[PDB]
Design an enzyme around this catalytic site. Structure first.
Site, PDB file in Angstrom:
ATOM      1  N   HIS A  68      -5.008  20.339  19.312  1.00 45.32           N
ATOM      2  CA  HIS A  68      -4.891  21.072  20.596  1.00 45.32           C
ATOM      3  C   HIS A  68      -6.064  21.961  21.081  1.00 45.32           C
ATOM      4  CE1 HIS A  68      -0.547  20.881  19.400  1.00 45.32           C
ATOM      5  NE2 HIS A  68      -0.628  20.544  20.526  1.00 45.32           N
ATOM      6  N   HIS A  72      -8.270  17.570  23.989  1.00 43.23           N
ATOM      7  CA  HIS A  72      -6.913  17.213  24.349  1.00 43.23           C
ATOM      8  C   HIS A  72      -6.836  17.544  25.982  1.00 43.23           C
ATOM      9  CE1 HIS A  72      -2.743  16.782  24.305  1.00 43.23           C
ATOM     10  NE2 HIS A  72      -2.554  18.013  24.624  1.00 43.23           N
ATOM     11  N   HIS A 106      -2.969  22.868  30.303  1.00 46.27           N
ATOM     12  CA  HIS A 106      -1.601  22.970  29.824  1.00 46.27           C
ATOM     13  C   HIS A 106      -1.425  23.296  28.330  1.00 46.27           C
ATOM     14  CE1 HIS A 106      -2.473  19.375  27.567  1.00 46.27           C
ATOM     15  NE2 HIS A 106      -1.196  19.531  26.935  1.00 46.27           N
ATOM     16  N   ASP A 107      -2.575  23.404  27.711  1.00 41.45           N
ATOM     17  CA  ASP A 107      -2.647  23.731  26.177  1.00 41.45           C
ATOM     18  C   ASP A 107      -3.438  24.966  26.155  1.00 41.45           C
ATOM     19  OD1 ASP A 107      -0.435  22.837  24.666  1.00 41.45           O
ATOM     20  OD2 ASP A 107      -1.565  21.103  24.279  1.00 41.45           O
ATOM     21  N   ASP A 217       0.954  14.024  28.300  1.00 41.14           N
ATOM     22  CA  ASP A 217       0.759  14.744  26.677  1.00 41.14           C
ATOM     23  C   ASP A 217       0.482  13.947  25.571  1.00 41.14           C
ATOM     24  OD1 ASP A 217       0.033  17.084  25.500  1.00 41.14           O
ATOM     25  OD2 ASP A 217       2.160  17.765  25.664  1.00 41.14           O
ATOM     26  N   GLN A 269       5.960   8.532  11.962  1.00 43.15           N
ATOM     27  CA  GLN A 269       5.242   7.865  13.219  1.00 43.15           C
ATOM     28  C   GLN A 269       6.541   6.954  13.715  1.00 43.15           C
ATOM     29  OE1 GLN A 269       2.457   8.698  15.100  1.00 43.15           O
ATOM     30  NE2 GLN A 269       3.260  10.201  13.710  1.00 43.15           N
TER      31      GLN A 269
END
Ligand SMILES: Cn1ncc(C(=O)N2CCC2)c1C(=O)Nc1ccn(C2CCCC2)n1
Ligand SMILES: [Mg+2]
Ligand SMILES: [Zn+2]
Length: 313
Positions: A68, A72, A106-107, A217, A269
């Site tokens: 993050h 990213h 956004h992060d 994202d 996953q």
């Protein structure tokens, strides 16, 4: 005004593709972002002096966590860039401006821990924002940075355009809260299947922009297999650190986050691709047909995860 950014030929060609990787050179990511703004939005959208000062304040306010992080930020912004370029005429001037900035921000100031961990730790941000905790914090940090002397990249819009663009960004950043993703996509599915989906309906656009944000994202799962695979180490590196901190509070973490259950990763996953990613890019391909390459890449990578479990890598 007459100063274009340009990329070396390989980047120049490849940046247009959904599966583009921004590379290991940090010092090129700002110019990659600016390049994308000039081709998406125009050379006029933003005072270059201000845009550059905004980008570097935002870089400064991402932390050095495994996933993050600033890389990213720019990866998520590039996916939005690919979506916008392949769907040129469905989006307003404002929307192209707001969304690439929403993705970059956004992060902002993420510490590498879920909303769940803030709440079990009883972090102040969990007292201040009861749901979408980190995501309301990210929007709060974005407004802070916009308000630094010389940082208001939007100062040239009218009062109303300004209010619209901040409302676009706020919704965009809140939509990156995956707890909200499931219902948002269910509603888009119903609305597209029953034929009631209408992109002049603002509340419908808001939902579509939300799915676009979730899609950008998660875009690590739409890259070449070596990128997807090496990014999931970074993703599990934060998960395991969060599991460690849960155990420190005397709580057994979910197996997803327990570094003693690495064996169970490929199967985890599978759940994530089947329960989250594939449905995300499916509904997005239905609503925005030219985004099909994200769905095709995602399926290829589920298939590479199945191969890992069968022992074939
Ligand atoms: C690969 N990738 N990319 C983004 C994320 C993610 O969720 N993060 C980034 C913010 C939260 C993941 C990811 O592995 N999620 C996973 C992995 C296992 N699960 C469980 C839920 C469903 C079944 C098992 N979910
Ligand atoms: Mg986030
Ligand atoms: Zn993110």
């Amino acid at each position: 005004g007459l100063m274009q950014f340009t990329l070396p030929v390989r980047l120049c060609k490849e940046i247009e593709l959904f599966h583009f990787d921004i590379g290991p050179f940090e010092n090129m990511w700002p110019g990659i972002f600016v390049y994308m703004v000039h081709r998406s939005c125009g050379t006029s959208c933003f005072e270059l002096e201000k845009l550059c000062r905004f980008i570097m304040s935002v870089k400064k306010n991402y932390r050095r966590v495994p996933y993050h992080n600033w890389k990213h930020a720019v990866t998520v912004a590039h996916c939005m860039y690919a979506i916008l370029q392949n769907n040129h005429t469905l989006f307003t001037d404002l929307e192209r401006k707001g969304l690439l900035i929403a993705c970059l921000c956004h992060d902002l100031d993420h510490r590498g821990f879920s909303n769940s961990y803030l709440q079990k730790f009883d972090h102040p941000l969990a007292a201040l924002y009861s749901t979408s905790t980190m995501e309301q914090h990210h929007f709060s940090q974005t407004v802070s940075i916009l308000q630094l002397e010389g940082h208001n990249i939007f100062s040239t819009l009218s009062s109303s355009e300004y209010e619209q663009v901040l409302e676009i960004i706020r919704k965009a950043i809140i939509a990156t809260d995956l707890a909200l993703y499931f219902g948002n996509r269910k509603q888009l599915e119903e609305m597209y299947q029953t034929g009631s989906l209408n992109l002049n309906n603002q509340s419908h656009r808001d939902r579509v922009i939300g799915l676009m944000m979730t899609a950008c994202d998660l875009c690590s799962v739409t890259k070449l297999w070596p990128v997807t695979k090496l990014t999931a180490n970074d993703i599990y590196a934060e998960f395991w650190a969060e599991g460690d901190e849960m155990k420190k509070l005397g709580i057994q973490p979910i197996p997803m986050m327990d570094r003693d259950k690495k064996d169970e990763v490929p199967q985890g996953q599978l759940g994530f691709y089947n329960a989250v990613a594939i449905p995300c890019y499916t509904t997005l391909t239905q609503i925005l047909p030219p985004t099909e390459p994200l769905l095709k890449a995602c399926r290829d990578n589920l298939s590479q995860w199945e191969k890992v479990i069968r022992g074939e890598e």
